[PDB]
């Protein structure tokens, strides 16, 4: 789990975000990696490091792999699989003038496969959204930052009443009671399918976060993006039953997606 910084070569800065700067590099001069330099005070570092091996054990081809951490210096580095096309949210917005509708369904299948694997381990993602998915050089979408919100220090992001909480991806039981489960990841997946089929538009864009939480509590839901067929919309809408126990599992969604692909 501990990577020696001597084996890393840094090659290009890719960007910066909430948890720090990301660079593309090589491990032992040969293997592509992404390196995130964790922003001081953003994470519970000791707790993350003791559990980095847990996340390293979650190996599925549609999860962005965590390769290890460098912790004998400041800042700590988190080393992962390199995803050359970057965030899914930005990639969807760039796809707007060049795509086949068939590719949108294959992106949903990729994310669903990763989430069926996490569900099989009873591992909660807690912030599934297009901004937390990445895209590789072959256009395969993979899920990233799985479970990370448990280690974030800023209550503005982790509390349901924080200005930065992912209200637009959350079901009623999370907004009201902070009750997370595999079924709150199912709700967020349906919003992510809506983001894919809307080519990266913001969900509930006419509403503030406070108005969105009221809108969802009143039973109102996202309408059908024009690119989604009625069979595709039926799948995303199934993720949004008010009662969590009425929402499907990721194994059922995957079979439904594969049925639409087949037909
Ligand atoms: C699998 O990782 C985890 C799993 C569980 C967990 F709890 C935490 C982590 C974690 O912290 N990973 C650190 C990390 C996250 C994202 C990128 C990354 N980001 N980006 C872009 C948006 C940009 F712009 F930031 F560069 C890539 N292309 C990236 C790329 N990998 O090519 C790089 C490293």
mmCIF file of C-alpha atoms and ligand atoms in Angstrom:
data_model
loop_
_atom_site.group_PDB
_atom_site.id
_atom_site.type_symbol
_atom_site.label_atom_id
_atom_site.label_comp_id
_atom_site.label_asym_id
_atom_site.label_seq_id
_atom_site.Cartn_x
_atom_site.Cartn_y
_atom_site.Cartn_z
ATOM 1 C CA UNK A 1 0.000 0.000 0.000
ATOM 2 C CA UNK A 2 2.975 2.356 0.563
ATOM 3 C CA UNK A 3 4.551 3.648 -2.646
ATOM 4 C CA UNK A 4 8.087 5.005 -2.539
ATOM 5 C CA UNK A 5 8.203 8.520 -4.068
ATOM 6 C CA UNK A 6 11.606 7.606 -5.575
ATOM 7 C CA UNK A 7 9.762 5.358 -8.045
ATOM 8 C CA UNK A 8 7.532 8.219 -9.320
ATOM 9 C CA UNK A 9 8.291 10.541 -12.242
ATOM 10 C CA UNK A 10 5.948 13.539 -12.703
ATOM 11 C CA UNK A 11 5.095 14.482 -16.324
ATOM 12 C CA UNK A 12 2.090 16.825 -16.669
ATOM 13 C CA UNK A 13 -0.280 18.735 -14.277
ATOM 14 C CA UNK A 14 -3.804 17.632 -15.082
ATOM 15 C CA UNK A 15 -5.827 19.900 -12.818
ATOM 16 C CA UNK A 16 -6.762 20.860 -9.238
ATOM 17 C CA UNK A 17 -9.886 20.283 -7.188
ATOM 18 C CA UNK A 18 -11.380 19.919 -3.741
ATOM 19 C CA UNK A 19 -8.780 17.434 -2.541
ATOM 20 C CA UNK A 20 -5.686 18.722 -4.306
ATOM 21 C CA UNK A 21 -3.557 18.896 -7.397
ATOM 22 C CA UNK A 22 -3.445 15.966 -9.863
ATOM 23 C CA UNK A 23 -0.448 15.095 -11.992
ATOM 24 C CA UNK A 24 0.132 12.440 -14.654
ATOM 25 C CA UNK A 25 3.320 10.455 -14.097
ATOM 26 C CA UNK A 26 5.058 7.070 -14.382
ATOM 27 C CA UNK A 27 5.859 4.435 -11.813
ATOM 28 C CA UNK A 28 9.344 2.875 -12.212
ATOM 29 C CA UNK A 29 9.677 4.845 -15.501
ATOM 30 C CA UNK A 30 7.182 2.529 -17.220
ATOM 31 C CA UNK A 31 3.582 2.404 -15.852
ATOM 32 C CA UNK A 32 1.147 5.312 -16.278
ATOM 33 C CA UNK A 33 -0.315 6.630 -13.033
ATOM 34 C CA UNK A 34 -2.230 9.666 -11.775
ATOM 35 C CA UNK A 35 -0.943 11.260 -8.557
ATOM 36 C CA UNK A 36 -3.134 13.416 -6.329
ATOM 37 C CA UNK A 37 -1.320 15.617 -3.808
ATOM 38 C CA UNK A 38 -3.707 15.930 -0.966
ATOM 39 C CA UNK A 39 -4.673 19.405 0.128
ATOM 40 C CA UNK A 40 -3.661 20.055 3.730
ATOM 41 C CA UNK A 41 -6.633 19.922 6.109
ATOM 42 C CA UNK A 42 -9.038 18.435 3.527
ATOM 43 C CA UNK A 43 -8.971 14.822 4.733
ATOM 44 C CA UNK A 44 -8.666 12.632 7.833
ATOM 45 C CA UNK A 45 -5.286 11.441 6.617
ATOM 46 C CA UNK A 46 -4.375 8.984 9.391
ATOM 47 C CA UNK A 47 -7.762 7.247 8.997
ATOM 48 C CA UNK A 48 -7.472 7.160 5.186
ATOM 49 C CA UNK A 49 -3.948 5.697 5.294
ATOM 50 C CA UNK A 50 -4.877 2.876 7.725
ATOM 51 C CA UNK A 51 -7.779 1.968 5.331
ATOM 52 C CA UNK A 52 -6.050 2.563 1.933
ATOM 53 C CA UNK A 53 -5.535 -1.198 1.686
ATOM 54 C CA UNK A 54 -9.370 -1.729 1.958
ATOM 55 C CA UNK A 55 -10.007 0.474 -1.094
ATOM 56 C CA UNK A 56 -6.961 -1.094 -2.858
ATOM 57 C CA UNK A 57 -8.759 -4.491 -2.492
ATOM 58 C CA UNK A 58 -11.767 -3.237 -4.502
ATOM 59 C CA UNK A 59 -10.626 -4.441 -7.856
ATOM 60 C CA UNK A 60 -13.085 -4.389 -10.672
ATOM 61 C CA UNK A 61 -12.315 -3.333 -14.229
ATOM 62 C CA UNK A 62 -14.916 -0.479 -14.058
ATOM 63 C CA UNK A 63 -13.535 1.000 -10.763
ATOM 64 C CA UNK A 64 -10.608 3.439 -11.022
ATOM 65 C CA UNK A 65 -7.894 1.503 -9.195
ATOM 66 C CA UNK A 66 -6.228 2.845 -6.111
ATOM 67 C CA UNK A 67 -2.564 1.721 -6.384
ATOM 68 C CA UNK A 68 -1.237 3.117 -3.101
ATOM 69 C CA UNK A 69 -0.194 6.120 -1.047
ATOM 70 C CA UNK A 70 3.031 7.990 -0.326
ATOM 71 C CA UNK A 71 2.906 9.072 3.342
ATOM 72 C CA UNK A 72 6.446 9.798 4.526
ATOM 73 C CA UNK A 73 6.282 13.452 3.311
ATOM 74 C CA UNK A 74 3.934 16.480 3.211
ATOM 75 C CA UNK A 75 1.633 16.498 1.348
ATOM 76 C CA UNK A 76 0.520 12.829 1.167
ATOM 77 C CA UNK A 77 0.073 11.481 -2.371
ATOM 78 C CA UNK A 78 -2.687 9.116 -3.542
ATOM 79 C CA UNK A 79 -1.651 7.104 -6.622
ATOM 80 C CA UNK A 80 -4.285 5.717 -8.995
ATOM 81 C CA UNK A 81 -4.958 4.363 -12.423
ATOM 82 C CA UNK A 82 -4.509 7.091 -15.066
ATOM 83 C CA UNK A 83 -7.725 8.140 -16.855
ATOM 84 C CA UNK A 84 -6.619 10.197 -19.801
ATOM 85 C CA UNK A 85 -9.982 11.662 -20.721
ATOM 86 C CA UNK A 86 -10.600 13.076 -17.228
ATOM 87 C CA UNK A 87 -13.862 13.742 -15.526
ATOM 88 C CA UNK A 88 -17.029 12.214 -17.042
ATOM 89 C CA UNK A 89 -18.867 15.508 -16.437
ATOM 90 C CA UNK A 90 -16.463 17.444 -18.649
ATOM 91 C CA UNK A 91 -16.222 14.606 -21.193
ATOM 92 C CA UNK A 92 -20.042 14.573 -21.618
ATOM 93 C CA UNK A 93 -20.015 18.326 -22.300
ATOM 94 C CA UNK A 94 -17.311 17.860 -24.955
ATOM 95 C CA UNK A 95 -19.179 14.864 -26.569
ATOM 96 C CA UNK A 96 -22.137 17.243 -27.362
ATOM 97 C CA UNK A 97 -21.178 17.732 -30.958
ATOM 98 C CA UNK A 98 -19.777 14.210 -31.613
ATOM 99 C CA UNK A 99 -21.560 11.004 -30.283
ATOM 100 C CA UNK A 100 -23.846 7.953 -31.069
ATOM 101 C CA UNK A 101 -26.783 7.510 -28.579
ATOM 102 C CA UNK A 102 -25.600 3.879 -28.237
ATOM 103 C CA UNK A 103 -22.430 5.138 -26.486
ATOM 104 C CA UNK A 104 -24.525 6.785 -23.744
ATOM 105 C CA UNK A 105 -26.083 3.464 -22.815
ATOM 106 C CA UNK A 106 -22.643 1.781 -22.739
ATOM 107 C CA UNK A 107 -21.472 4.493 -20.234
ATOM 108 C CA UNK A 108 -24.441 3.613 -17.991
ATOM 109 C CA UNK A 109 -23.554 -0.089 -18.254
ATOM 110 C CA UNK A 110 -19.913 0.622 -17.269
ATOM 111 C CA UNK A 111 -20.950 2.535 -14.138
ATOM 112 C CA UNK A 112 -23.628 -0.055 -13.279
ATOM 113 C CA UNK A 113 -21.089 -2.904 -13.437
ATOM 114 C CA UNK A 114 -18.794 -1.045 -10.975
ATOM 115 C CA UNK A 115 -21.689 -0.376 -8.641
ATOM 116 C CA UNK A 116 -22.968 -3.991 -8.768
ATOM 117 C CA UNK A 117 -19.440 -4.989 -7.623
ATOM 118 C CA UNK A 118 -19.445 -2.403 -4.763
ATOM 119 C CA UNK A 119 -22.990 -3.568 -3.760
ATOM 120 C CA UNK A 120 -21.722 -7.192 -3.650
ATOM 121 C CA UNK A 121 -19.232 -6.059 -0.940
ATOM 122 C CA UNK A 122 -21.873 -3.881 0.837
ATOM 123 C CA UNK A 123 -19.480 -0.960 0.151
ATOM 124 C CA UNK A 124 -21.177 2.437 -0.090
ATOM 125 C CA UNK A 125 -19.976 4.967 -2.600
ATOM 126 C CA UNK A 126 -21.886 7.935 -1.002
ATOM 127 C CA UNK A 127 -21.189 10.483 -3.756
ATOM 128 C CA UNK A 128 -21.919 8.845 -7.080
ATOM 129 C CA UNK A 129 -22.227 11.559 -9.779
ATOM 130 C CA UNK A 130 -20.681 12.306 -13.177
ATOM 131 C CA UNK A 131 -18.059 14.583 -11.570
ATOM 132 C CA UNK A 132 -16.790 11.495 -9.588
ATOM 133 C CA UNK A 133 -16.452 9.245 -12.662
ATOM 134 C CA UNK A 134 -13.467 9.276 -14.967
ATOM 135 C CA UNK A 135 -12.924 8.282 -18.588
ATOM 136 C CA UNK A 136 -9.905 6.455 -20.002
ATOM 137 C CA UNK A 137 -8.202 6.723 -23.403
ATOM 138 C CA UNK A 138 -10.553 4.104 -24.892
ATOM 139 C CA UNK A 139 -13.695 5.966 -23.697
ATOM 140 C CA UNK A 140 -14.465 3.511 -20.894
ATOM 141 C CA UNK A 141 -16.125 5.152 -17.888
ATOM 142 C CA UNK A 142 -15.008 4.088 -14.453
ATOM 143 C CA UNK A 143 -16.169 5.018 -10.973
ATOM 144 C CA UNK A 144 -13.790 6.945 -8.739
ATOM 145 C CA UNK A 145 -13.527 8.310 -5.151
ATOM 146 C CA UNK A 146 -15.634 5.455 -3.842
ATOM 147 C CA UNK A 147 -16.231 5.880 -0.096
ATOM 148 C CA UNK A 148 -14.118 9.049 0.090
ATOM 149 C CA UNK A 149 -16.721 11.323 1.733
ATOM 150 C CA UNK A 150 -16.311 9.402 5.020
ATOM 151 C CA UNK A 151 -12.827 10.968 5.313
ATOM 152 C CA UNK A 152 -13.624 14.573 4.310
ATOM 153 C CA UNK A 153 -13.228 17.139 7.094
ATOM 154 C CA UNK A 154 -15.428 19.987 5.797
ATOM 155 C CA UNK A 155 -19.013 19.636 7.200
ATOM 156 C CA UNK A 156 -20.181 21.968 4.401
ATOM 157 C CA UNK A 157 -19.698 18.881 2.099
ATOM 158 C CA UNK A 158 -20.540 15.904 4.383
ATOM 159 C CA UNK A 159 -23.601 17.247 6.230
ATOM 160 C CA UNK A 160 -27.041 17.160 4.562
ATOM 161 C CA UNK A 161 -27.472 20.869 5.531
ATOM 162 C CA UNK A 162 -24.056 21.951 4.211
ATOM 163 C CA UNK A 163 -24.040 24.293 1.242
ATOM 164 C CA UNK A 164 -21.738 21.889 -0.652
ATOM 165 C CA UNK A 165 -23.633 18.615 0.017
ATOM 166 C CA UNK A 166 -24.717 16.686 -3.161
ATOM 167 C CA UNK A 167 -28.407 17.468 -2.659
ATOM 168 C CA UNK A 168 -29.225 16.956 -6.363
ATOM 169 C CA UNK A 169 -28.057 13.317 -6.194
ATOM 170 C CA UNK A 170 -29.681 12.397 -2.863
ATOM 171 C CA UNK A 171 -32.902 10.575 -1.989
ATOM 172 C CA UNK A 172 -35.433 11.824 0.578
ATOM 173 C CA UNK A 173 -34.111 9.611 3.416
ATOM 174 C CA UNK A 174 -30.612 11.068 3.003
ATOM 175 C CA UNK A 175 -31.787 14.697 2.779
ATOM 176 C CA UNK A 176 -33.988 14.340 5.884
ATOM 177 C CA UNK A 177 -32.273 11.675 8.016
ATOM 178 C CA UNK A 178 -28.765 11.159 6.624
ATOM 179 C CA UNK A 179 -29.711 7.464 6.106
ATOM 180 C CA UNK A 180 -27.189 6.076 3.569
ATOM 181 C CA UNK A 181 -27.474 2.578 2.103
ATOM 182 C CA UNK A 182 -27.103 0.709 -1.191
ATOM 183 C CA UNK A 183 -30.497 2.334 -2.076
ATOM 184 C CA UNK A 184 -29.163 5.860 -1.763
ATOM 185 C CA UNK A 185 -26.383 4.855 -4.233
ATOM 186 C CA UNK A 186 -29.193 3.510 -6.488
ATOM 187 C CA UNK A 187 -30.950 6.926 -6.394
ATOM 188 C CA UNK A 188 -27.704 8.695 -7.276
ATOM 189 C CA UNK A 189 -27.135 6.270 -10.170
ATOM 190 C CA UNK A 190 -30.463 7.225 -11.662
ATOM 191 C CA UNK A 191 -29.428 10.923 -11.459
ATOM 192 C CA UNK A 192 -26.088 9.964 -13.090
ATOM 193 C CA UNK A 193 -27.976 8.220 -15.953
ATOM 194 C CA UNK A 194 -29.957 11.497 -16.344
ATOM 195 C CA UNK A 195 -26.630 13.453 -16.429
ATOM 196 C CA UNK A 196 -25.287 11.096 -19.149
ATOM 197 C CA UNK A 197 -28.428 11.312 -21.273
ATOM 198 C CA UNK A 198 -28.512 15.115 -20.806
ATOM 199 C CA UNK A 199 -24.819 15.372 -21.895
ATOM 200 C CA UNK A 200 -23.758 16.906 -18.577
ATOM 201 C CA UNK A 201 -26.529 19.328 -17.751
ATOM 202 C CA UNK A 202 -27.052 20.142 -14.070
ATOM 203 C CA UNK A 203 -30.019 18.274 -12.552
ATOM 204 C CA UNK A 204 -32.916 20.509 -11.385
ATOM 205 C CA UNK A 205 -31.058 23.494 -12.842
ATOM 206 C CA UNK A 206 -33.930 26.026 -12.334
ATOM 207 C CA UNK A 207 -33.924 25.308 -8.573
ATOM 208 C CA UNK A 208 -31.622 26.089 -5.657
ATOM 209 C CA UNK A 209 -30.424 23.194 -3.398
ATOM 210 C CA UNK A 210 -33.072 24.095 -0.790
ATOM 211 C CA UNK A 211 -35.802 24.186 -3.448
ATOM 212 C CA UNK A 212 -34.535 20.897 -4.931
ATOM 213 C CA UNK A 213 -34.796 19.152 -1.518
ATOM 214 C CA UNK A 214 -38.421 20.399 -1.197
ATOM 215 C CA UNK A 215 -39.163 19.419 -4.844
ATOM 216 C CA UNK A 216 -37.962 15.843 -4.218
ATOM 217 C CA UNK A 217 -39.805 15.565 -0.888
ATOM 218 C CA UNK A 218 -43.028 16.610 -2.743
ATOM 219 C CA UNK A 219 -42.487 13.661 -5.150
ATOM 220 C CA UNK A 220 -41.402 15.684 -8.180
ATOM 221 C CA UNK A 221 -38.737 14.082 -10.411
ATOM 222 C CA UNK A 222 -36.397 14.801 -13.272
ATOM 223 C CA UNK A 223 -38.127 14.686 -16.685
ATOM 224 C CA UNK A 224 -36.928 12.525 -19.596
ATOM 225 C CA UNK A 225 -33.909 13.916 -21.456
ATOM 226 C CA UNK A 226 -34.731 14.017 -25.190
ATOM 227 C CA UNK A 227 -31.890 11.518 -25.947
ATOM 228 C CA UNK A 228 -33.326 8.903 -23.632
ATOM 229 C CA UNK A 229 -35.864 6.465 -25.034
ATOM 230 C CA UNK A 230 -38.863 5.592 -22.862
ATOM 231 C CA UNK A 231 -37.235 2.230 -21.952
ATOM 232 C CA UNK A 232 -34.065 4.096 -20.779
ATOM 233 C CA UNK A 233 -36.174 6.615 -18.808
ATOM 234 C CA UNK A 234 -38.104 3.814 -17.164
ATOM 235 C CA UNK A 235 -34.769 2.451 -15.849
ATOM 236 C CA UNK A 236 -33.570 5.777 -14.433
ATOM 237 C CA UNK A 237 -37.008 6.541 -12.986
ATOM 238 C CA UNK A 238 -37.055 3.173 -11.150
ATOM 239 C CA UNK A 239 -34.116 4.527 -9.078
ATOM 240 C CA UNK A 240 -36.337 7.285 -7.666
ATOM 241 C CA UNK A 241 -39.114 5.532 -5.750
ATOM 242 C CA UNK A 242 -39.774 7.482 -2.576
ATOM 243 C CA UNK A 243 -39.510 4.256 -0.541
ATOM 244 C CA UNK A 244 -35.949 2.949 -0.582
ATOM 245 C CA UNK A 245 -37.021 -0.691 -0.369
ATOM 246 C CA UNK A 246 -38.947 -0.279 -3.685
ATOM 247 C CA UNK A 247 -35.804 0.727 -5.625
ATOM 248 C CA UNK A 248 -34.026 -1.997 -7.614
ATOM 249 C CA UNK A 249 -30.586 -3.492 -6.916
ATOM 250 C CA UNK A 250 -27.625 -2.795 -9.204
ATOM 251 C CA UNK A 251 -27.866 -6.446 -10.434
ATOM 252 C CA UNK A 252 -31.443 -5.740 -11.616
ATOM 253 C CA UNK A 253 -30.457 -2.407 -13.226
ATOM 254 C CA UNK A 254 -27.585 -4.118 -15.056
ATOM 255 C CA UNK A 255 -29.909 -6.745 -16.468
ATOM 256 C CA UNK A 256 -32.387 -4.055 -17.526
ATOM 257 C CA UNK A 257 -29.624 -2.049 -19.236
ATOM 258 C CA UNK A 258 -28.323 -5.176 -21.054
ATOM 259 C CA UNK A 259 -31.945 -5.920 -22.170
ATOM 260 C CA UNK A 260 -32.278 -2.407 -23.709
ATOM 261 C CA UNK A 261 -28.872 -2.849 -25.397
ATOM 262 C CA UNK A 262 -29.938 -6.268 -26.809
ATOM 263 C CA UNK A 263 -33.210 -4.887 -28.162
HETATM 264 C C1 LIG B 1 -9.651 5.585 -7.016
HETATM 265 O O1 LIG B 1 -9.345 6.691 -6.145
HETATM 266 C C2 LIG B 1 -9.952 6.724 -4.919
HETATM 267 C C3 LIG B 1 -10.807 5.721 -4.463
HETATM 268 C C4 LIG B 1 -11.373 5.817 -3.207
HETATM 269 C C5 LIG B 1 -11.070 6.896 -2.448
HETATM 270 F F1 LIG B 1 -11.660 6.986 -1.223
HETATM 271 C C6 LIG B 1 -10.228 7.907 -2.839
HETATM 272 C C7 LIG B 1 -9.653 7.828 -4.111
HETATM 273 C C8 LIG B 1 -8.764 8.980 -4.442
HETATM 274 O O2 LIG B 1 -8.662 9.937 -3.671
HETATM 275 N N1 LIG B 1 -8.110 8.953 -5.602
HETATM 276 C C9 LIG B 1 -7.169 9.992 -5.996
HETATM 277 C C10 LIG B 1 -7.398 10.483 -7.399
HETATM 278 C C11 LIG B 1 -8.664 10.776 -7.870
HETATM 279 C C12 LIG B 1 -8.856 11.278 -9.141
HETATM 280 C C13 LIG B 1 -7.772 11.488 -9.991
HETATM 281 C C14 LIG B 1 -7.969 12.054 -11.333
HETATM 282 N N2 LIG B 1 -8.533 13.261 -11.443
HETATM 283 N N3 LIG B 1 -8.485 13.576 -12.788
HETATM 284 C C15 LIG B 1 -9.052 14.835 -13.273
HETATM 285 C C16 LIG B 1 -10.484 15.040 -12.784
HETATM 286 C C17 LIG B 1 -8.151 15.980 -12.881
HETATM 287 F F2 LIG B 1 -8.485 17.101 -13.528
HETATM 288 F F3 LIG B 1 -8.163 16.235 -11.576
HETATM 289 F F4 LIG B 1 -6.888 15.719 -13.193
HETATM 290 C C18 LIG B 1 -7.908 12.595 -13.508
HETATM 291 N N4 LIG B 1 -7.809 12.594 -14.873
HETATM 292 C C19 LIG B 1 -7.575 11.568 -12.616
HETATM 293 C C20 LIG B 1 -6.971 10.297 -13.036
HETATM 294 N N5 LIG B 1 -6.969 9.271 -12.193
HETATM 295 O O3 LIG B 1 -6.549 10.196 -14.194
HETATM 296 C C21 LIG B 1 -6.499 11.153 -9.535
HETATM 297 C C22 LIG B 1 -6.317 10.657 -8.254
#
